[PDB]
Amino acid sequence: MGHIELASPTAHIWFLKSLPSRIGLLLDMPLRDIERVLYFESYVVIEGGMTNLERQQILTEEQYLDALEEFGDEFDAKMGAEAIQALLKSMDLEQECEQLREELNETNSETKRKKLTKRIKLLEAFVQSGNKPEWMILTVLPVLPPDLRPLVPLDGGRFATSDLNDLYRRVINRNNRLKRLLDLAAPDIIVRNEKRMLQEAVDALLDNGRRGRAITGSNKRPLKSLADMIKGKQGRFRQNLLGKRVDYSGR
Amino acid sequence: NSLYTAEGVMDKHSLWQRYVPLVRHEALRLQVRLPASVELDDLLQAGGIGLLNAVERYDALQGTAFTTYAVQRIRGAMLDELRSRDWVPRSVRRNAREVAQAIGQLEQELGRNATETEVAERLGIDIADYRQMLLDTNNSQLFSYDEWREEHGDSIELVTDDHQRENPLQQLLDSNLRQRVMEAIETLPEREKLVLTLYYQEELNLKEIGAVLEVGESRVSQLHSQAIKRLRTKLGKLL
Amino acid sequence: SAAVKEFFGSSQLSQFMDQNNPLSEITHKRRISALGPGGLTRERAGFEV
Amino acid sequence: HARSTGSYSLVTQQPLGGKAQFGGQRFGEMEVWALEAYGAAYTLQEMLTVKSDDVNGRTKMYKNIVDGNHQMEPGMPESFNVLLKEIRSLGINIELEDE
Amino acid sequence: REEAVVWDILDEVIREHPVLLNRAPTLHRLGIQAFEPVLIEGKAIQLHPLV
Amino acid sequence: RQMLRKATIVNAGSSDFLEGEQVEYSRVKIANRELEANGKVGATYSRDLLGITKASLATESFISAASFQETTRVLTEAAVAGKRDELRGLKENVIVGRLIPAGTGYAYHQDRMRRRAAG
Amino acid sequence: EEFDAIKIALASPDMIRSWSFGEVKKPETINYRTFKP
Amino acid sequence: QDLVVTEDDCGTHEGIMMTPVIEGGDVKEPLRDRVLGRVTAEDVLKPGTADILVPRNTLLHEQWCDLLEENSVDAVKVRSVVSCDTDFGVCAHCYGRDLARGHIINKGEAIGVIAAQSIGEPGTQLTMSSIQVKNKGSIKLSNVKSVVNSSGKLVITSRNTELKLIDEFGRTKESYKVPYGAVLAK
DNA sequence: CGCCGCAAACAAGTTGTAGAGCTTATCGGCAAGGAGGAAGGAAACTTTATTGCT
DNA sequence: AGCAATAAAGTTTCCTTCCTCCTTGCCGATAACGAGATCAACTTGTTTGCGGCG
Ligand SMILES: [Zn+2]
C-alpha cells in the first residue's frame, strides 16, 4: 500500500455512529452536541480562561458573540475536530478512574453503577491496551494497492474499474483545493464548507449510506465502500474464505 | 480574508458577499449532467474562489461592470472543475459537439436517419476521420460489479478472461534446454562457451565479450551458427 | 428513442421468448406477474398473496 | 463436466465455476461440518490450501504426483492476508504475534 | 490419441483407488460418502440403491 | 452447558464487585484463591444464563464472532482493547487453514501445544 | 510463514508512515489511450 | 465450534437422576433406553437392597438394562454432561457411548457438531371435570396437605398434590394431578 | 420508575440462463512549450559469401 | 579441414532534426433571467437496546 497526508484531522465512524460510542461515551457528552460540532454548527468551550464559563459548554455562534465581545481573550472556544482533539489530549485518566471508583461507593444505584463501571473499564482499557485516545483522530491514511481495486480494459478497448478509486479522487481534489485556498488566507466560510465536504467524502469512503445519504453513480446505485468486502454473505468469510471453489472435482 | 487596506477589504467582502446569489442562480441550471451536477456544493466553492481571483484584479477604468468582469472567471472555474473530472481530450469533444449539431441539423434537413455519406459530405474532411472518431468519442467506461441480470446469478467479475497467464511446463523445459545448451557447447571453444553461458544464463552482456577478445565477432558468428547446427541434432515439441 | 430502446431491451419484463414448443410461447405470452415497477418483491411479500 | 486443472480467478486466484469456462466445483461449510463430525484434518488442509488457493502448494504437489510422490506441504492462503490488508486500510493496526 | 494401453493402465491405477461422493445439501455427515470405483461405459453414474 | 458459561458476582476483593464473568474463571480463581492462597479475598457468585445468539457474540475470540454476524461491532470493541485470540477453536484454524485441534490432527495439535509450552 | 497468534491494535500515524512507501498527490491513474500508468 | 473431549475421565462428582417419561399414558421412553451406554453417578443397587454393580461407573449396555429390568428399579443418576468439571472440554465417561460406533468414546471427538446437525436435519420435516381410573393399582399421593371432607372423602388443602395409579408392585401406571380441594371418591 | 419511540438488522444451498446501455451535456482563443515523429539518412556494427593459404 | 581476406548487404543504433502536431497553462467585454426538489421508495418484520420521556 501507500498513503496520503491530510491537511487537517478527521474522525472515525465505526467509533461513532455505532452503538455505544466509546468517543463521547468516554467524555460523558451526548452524540447530538458532537454532531453539531463536527458538522460545523456550534462552537464549544475549549477552556474558559474565565471560570465565568465552563468546559464542554456549547456555544451557538450568536450567544458565543456575547461572551466574545464581553471578554474576547479570556476564553477558548472553537468548532471541529481539532477542538475535540486537544480536548481528548488534555484529560488525564488516572484521577477520573480513582474518583469514579470512589464516588461509586456513595450511591451505587443500578443504572448509575452500570455507567460508572462502563466508563471505568473504558479507562482501564485505554491504559492497559497502551492505546492513546489521541489516536482516535485521522490525519493520515493508507492507499490500497491497484491489484485490489483494479482497472482493466475490455474487448473493444472499454474499461472496468473499482469505485474505490472514484472516492479517493474527490478526497484528493478537496484537500488540494483546501491547500490552494489556505495559501490565500481566504474568508472562513468556504473553508468550513471545504471540510464538511472533506469529512463527508472520508466516511463515505469508509461506509457510504450510514451517516448521510449515499453517493451513487449515474445508475442511481451506490459507490460501494470497503465494509462490504467483509460483510453479509458477500464478504470474504461467507463467500470466499470458508466456501471454496475446487479443482480435481466434477459432477 | 483581508488585505493591507481594510476599507478595500470590507467593501471587497461585501461585494463578494452580495453576488453569491449570482454564483447560485447562474449555476442553478448547470444541473442534470455528471454527478457533481447533483452535488452543487463543489460549484459554490469553485465559484467563490474564482470570484476572489476576479476581485483581486478588478479593472475599473474600463467601466465594465464588476459582475460582467466576474461572470467570465466564474464560468472559468466551473468549467475547470468539470474538465478536471473528465480525462478525455478537448478537441475530441469539440468534434463531438460538432457532429451533434451537424447530424441533428441535417437530420431535420432530410427528415430521416443514418446515411453516413452525408456525414462524409457536410463534414467534408474524410471518412476515416470520423470513422476513427466514433471509436474515440462514442465509447465510455463502465464498472466491474454489475450483477448478471435475471436475478443476481453472478457478476461481471466471474465472466472475465486473461491472456498473460502462468504455465508450468514452458519454463520447466526452457530450463531443461538451458542445461542442454551448456551440454551442447561444453565441447566447443572456451570463450564462446562462456559467452553464451553468461549472456544466456545470468542475463548479462554479449558484446562485452567481443570487446574482451577484440577479434571483430566474426568467429563469434560462425561459432554461434555451429551451436545452432549442434542443437539441430535433437527433437523437442512446444513448437 | 433512448427510453424506447431501453425498456425494449432493459426492462425486467422484456424477455427472450421460449421457442421450444408452441405451448411454451403461447403460454409465456399469456403469463401474468405482479413484479417489476409498481409491484412487489419475493422476500418482502409473503403468503397472503 | 469434469475438471483437473486450468484457469483461475485473479483477485483471489482460486478457481471459477461453469462448464462454459472450465469450472471448478464448490465446497460449502456444510461439507466442512460433516467432515469435522468425522474429524479428518488433512483432508481439509488439502481442500482449502492446494485445491483452492496455495499456488506454491498446487505447483509442488503437481510436481510430486508426476514424480509418483503422494505427499503434502502447506503454506498460507493469500485470501487471508487480503482481509488483513483491508483491515489496515480501514485505519487499524491488525498484526500477528510470531512464535 | 487414446491408445488401448491408456485404458490398460487406467485399469491398473484405479483399483484400490477410492473417491468421495456428494449430494447437496449436506444436512448430516452421511450426506457424503467414500466409495470405490468401477468404470462403466456411459456418462451417468450408477449408485447402490440403499443409500 | 454452553448456554451457561458465565456468572455474575456477589462479593468482591479479587475483581470488580458484580462484573459479568465466566463462571468457569470464577471457579478457577476460587479454585486458586479461596484455597490456602487465602481463606477469602475472592468473591462468591450468582449464576447466569444467556440465549445463544449473543452468547456466541459474548466470547473470548473475536474471530468466530467476527465471522457471521455484526462483525464490525465486535471488531471495534475488541480493537479498542488490544485483544488477542489464541487459535483453539476450529474456525480459528480453518480460516488460517491450520490443522484442527482435534480428530486426526489432535495429536500434532497437542504436540504444537506442548511446543507452545516448551517454547 | 509459521506464526503463533493474532493481535489487533490501533493504527498510530507513524505506523502509517512506516508501512507506506510514498505519498500520492493527484487523482488520475493512466493515459486515456496509452494504456499505461 | 469450540467443543471437544479433552480428557479420558474427569473423575468428577455426581450428576442427574433419570426417572421415566411415562406421563399421561404408558412408557414413552424405557428407563433402559435412557440408560443405554450412560455411566452411573455412583454405586447402585437393587430392590432387594445393597447390590453394587458399578464402582461409580460402567458401560451400561444391554446386558445391564436386561439384568436390571429383571428387577423393578425406577431411578438412577449419572455423571451428567452438565456436571463434568473439566476446564475447556469434558470426559468421555460423562458422555457414555458413541451410538454410531457402539462403544465407549475415545478421547479427541467433537460433540456439539453432531448435536446441531443431528437436530437440524429432521427439523425440515418436523413442522409437517373428573378424574377416572381405568385399571387397578395402589394409590400414591405425596407432599399432601388434605382433609376428610364433610362427606367423609378426601379433599386437597395444598395445591402440591397429584394423583397416581401405582401398580400392585410399586411402579407407576398413571399420574394425573388433582385441583386444590377437589372432590374425591377415595 | 415504566413506558414510548426509534432505530438496527438477519432472512437455505449449489447449479445454471444470456446479453448492457446512458437524460445527458460540459469556452475558447492564445502561447509556449515540450514531447513526439517522421523523414531519410550516416554509420558502427554486424553479418554473408566468395576466393586465398596451413 | 582450420585459418583470413575482400566485397557486399543488412542492419540496429541513434541521433539529430526540422517539419508538424499536440497539449498544459492563462485570461476576457454589451445585460439579466432564479435558493434545489424531479423522479424515485414502497412501507418486511420481529427482537432488541437505548434515549427519552414521563
Ligand atoms: Zn467429564
UniProtKB/Swiss-Prot annotation, chain B:
GO cellular component entries: cytosol; cytosolic DNA-directed RNA polymerase complex
Domain of life, source organism: Bacteria
Region (Sigma-70 factor domain-3): 95-165
Cysteines engaged in disulfide bonds, as pairs: none
Effect of R97A: Strong decrease in activity
One Gene Ontology biological process: DNA-templated transcription initiation
Effect annotated for changing R83A: Loss of activity
Transcription regulation as UniProt keyword: yes
InterPro entries: RNA_pol_sigma-70_dom (IPR014284), RNA_pol_sigma70 (IPR000943), RNA_pol_sigma70_r2 (IPR007627), RNA_pol_sigma70_r3 (IPR007624), RNA_pol_sigma70_r4 (IPR007630), RNA_pol_sigma_FliA_WhiG (IPR012845), RNA_pol_sigma_r2 (IPR013325), RNA_pol_sigma_r3/r4-like (IPR013324)
Location of the protein in the cell: Cytoplasm
DNA-binding region per UniProt: 206-225
Effect of N95A: No change in activity
Protein family (similarity comment): Belongs to the sigma-70 factor family. FliA subfamily.
Role played: Sigma factors are initiation factors that promote the attachment of RNA polymerase to specific initiation sites and are then released. This sigma factor controls the expression of flagella-related genes.
Name by which UniProt lists this protein: RNA polymerase sigma factor FliA
The organism of origin for this protein: Escherichia coli (strain K12)
Name of the gene: fliA
Swiss-Prot record, chain C:
Entire-sequence positions represented here: 499 to 547 of 1342
Family of this protein: Belongs to the RNA polymerase beta chain family.
Transmembrane annotation, as ranges: none
Subunit description: The RNAP catalytic core consists of 2 alpha, 1 beta, 1 beta' and 1 omega subunit. When a sigma factor is associated with the core the holoenzyme is formed, which can initiate transcription.
UniProt name for this protein: DNA-directed RNA polymerase subunit beta
Disulfide bridge partners, by residue number: none
Secretion signal span: none
Highest rank taxon of the organism: Bacteria
Record function comment: DNA-dependent RNA polymerase catalyzes the transcription of DNA into RNA using the four ribonucleoside triphosphates as substrates.
UniProtKB/Swiss-Prot annotation, chain E:
Highest rank taxon of the organism: Bacteria
TM ranges: none
Coiled coil segments of this chain: none
Sequence similarity: Belongs to the RNA polymerase beta' chain family.
Job of this protein: DNA-dependent RNA polymerase catalyzes the transcription of DNA into RNA using the four ribonucleoside triphosphates as substrates.
Subunit structure: The RNAP catalytic core consists of 2 alpha, 1 beta, 1 beta' and 1 omega subunit. When a sigma factor is associated with the core the holoenzyme is formed, which can initiate transcription.
Record-given protein name: DNA-directed RNA polymerase subunit beta'
Curated annotation (Swiss-Prot), chain F:
SS bond list: none
Residues in coiled coil: none
Membership in a protein family: Belongs to the RNA polymerase beta' chain family.
Quaternary structure annotation from Swiss-Prot or TrEMBL: The RNAP catalytic core consists of 2 alpha, 1 beta, 1 beta' and 1 omega subunit. When a sigma factor is associated with the core the holoenzyme is formed, which can initiate transcription.
Function in brief: DNA-dependent RNA polymerase catalyzes the transcription of DNA into RNA using the four ribonucleoside triphosphates as substrates.
Protein name as annotated: DNA-directed RNA polymerase subunit beta'
Organism: Escherichia coli O157:H7
